[PDB]
Amino acid sequence: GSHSMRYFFTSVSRPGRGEPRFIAVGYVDDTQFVRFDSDAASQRMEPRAPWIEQEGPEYWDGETRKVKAHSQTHRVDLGTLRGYYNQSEAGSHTVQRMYGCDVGSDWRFLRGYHQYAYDGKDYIALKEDLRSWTAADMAAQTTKHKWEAAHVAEQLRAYLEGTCVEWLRRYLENGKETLQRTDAPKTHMTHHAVSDHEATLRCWALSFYPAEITLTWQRDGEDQTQDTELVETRPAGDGTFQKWAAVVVPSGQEQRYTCHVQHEGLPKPLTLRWEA
Amino acid sequence: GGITQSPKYLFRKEGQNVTLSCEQNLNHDAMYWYRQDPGQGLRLIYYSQIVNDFQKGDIAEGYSVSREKKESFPLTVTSAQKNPTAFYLCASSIGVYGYTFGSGTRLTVVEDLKNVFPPEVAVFEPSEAEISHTQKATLVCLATGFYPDHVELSWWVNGKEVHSGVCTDPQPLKEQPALNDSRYALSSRLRVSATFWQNPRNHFRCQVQFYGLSENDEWTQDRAKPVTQIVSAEAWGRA
Amino acid sequence: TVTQSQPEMSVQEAETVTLSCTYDTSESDYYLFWYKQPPSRQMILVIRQEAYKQQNATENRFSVNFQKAAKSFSLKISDSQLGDAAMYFCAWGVNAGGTSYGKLTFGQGTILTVHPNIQNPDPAVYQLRDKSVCLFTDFDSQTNVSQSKDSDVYITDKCVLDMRSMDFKSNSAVAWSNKSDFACANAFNNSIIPEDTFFPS
């Protein structure tokens, strides 16, 4: 199916405390495989998956050399944005950056991403066509014009459309055992009693990969947008994911409600009903 | 905006450190230093993608750089650099776009300082045989016995520099080739219409800019110091 | 590696000349350049090409033939002008995914000599008084001047000046020495010159 490689970068200024914090993390789909931490002792790009450890020394020296240049660039950008917005040197500010590429089942280029945020807000993003930018505000138009004159987008295309896909193919192959697997959700159900008449039903989906999933509550009948509790899909910590959906129902109609689980690993949607 | 490199000409005594300046107001992130040698292309020494970032080239040893500011990227040729005689080019870019190079710098190793000499300049008036045969008049300028090969020759007519009808040798000539240190000679030619030369109000001057010793250097010899100076020779039109 | 197999090349003014360049790399995408360095020593970009993109341009005389499979990036100069006399460098560079962006790796370069077309040759040797010098001028680009033994006589290679006002171009070489026997009649003996060269008496 579809796959993706994304790198997430976070820079946080710390005036009066020291250099800005810098964190880089790289993902293939919902699996992290590398990190760089300015506050760590190694000061190198570090493996975070077993299938990336097989890379030779030249790979880690290169990623180290590149990611430290990223670190230096966001360090400069923090000061530039402070000027663009005429902010004081006292407060702490955050720069976030994400880029990468998607591929389809054929592992061919599908989409490319390259976008920034300042203090949690969109600042400038590369458009889907990979040739123009979206400036969130008047201040970001200064960056937009700068990057248009320097033909940044044209130069980025080779990486997003080409090199990014080449990397992703390599990783998918070297980590076939884990990256290309599919774990179907293990489903069960629980019954909780709100006082007297009303009760809650919870649908559980556990130990599934990838994290993509949908849980819907059927009454009679069909879905219930109202009175449906849906927690964010969370990581189990062992490479799989968890999620549950809950509905509030009067007692005695438990048999009327049914849970629908759709996951990539499931041959067909699962339907759960009380009790078990 | 642009990129300015300096100095144009420069020499180093053995065991001496020297620094080349490079400044650019193109708002470019990356700056580079290249070294040019005959029989070889350009070879990267150092480059800085952004301030406080430094990447060595394959020939970095003996060199050093600093990038305290976005606009400046000075190069230092330390005494440890064994064979530094070459032509140095600064460059600036944002990725592969806006790639611009500086004017360039020529650095020479002068093992012995006594060898320096400024050029003696002489003009030679055109032959009346040429004037009658071709109705054109060619002036010849000779700059001789200068070392090192740091010269700029120009023609000035009536107070203004001229480039039309001019030819200067692409590279100078060694008066005594056998010697490893040899003084140089250079020739240039200026051709004008016969009528122009016949006018005696027309003034011709061959200017040679020599780059030699500086105040930092010490001169122990009786002969005048071979300092950076302009040696000129002139001629006047004759009917 | 970037390889320029011809250190020097000659062309006649108004004709065309092709400069060759071949490169070796494993990268799928990259950048190819041609730089011009005239006697001023100033680097001037002629053409940049990306492997992904297709050959394109040009409005100007200059053009390139890019053979991706063959790894050939030849530069074509047509209707050669005297100003095209310069050193031409082929260069290569990684794309944005590479570690050394944007370091340039240069070939050894090719010196292009442009031989002027002189319409009415009038070869002669003149004597100029201030020491004395002999001026060999107005010979055609086919004529060659040679360094001459003995060591105490100095001779410069031929050199082309352009009197733009008169649309006139001439060749010239200079010879000089301080010895006694030196004279213009025998100054250029070591060079083959037209027998009908004019020597004023």
Partner: peptide
């Protein structure tokens, strides 16, 4: 592998 091209806002 990450970008090798660095540029500033």
């Amino acid at each position: 592998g990450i970008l090798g091209f660095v540029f500033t806002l």
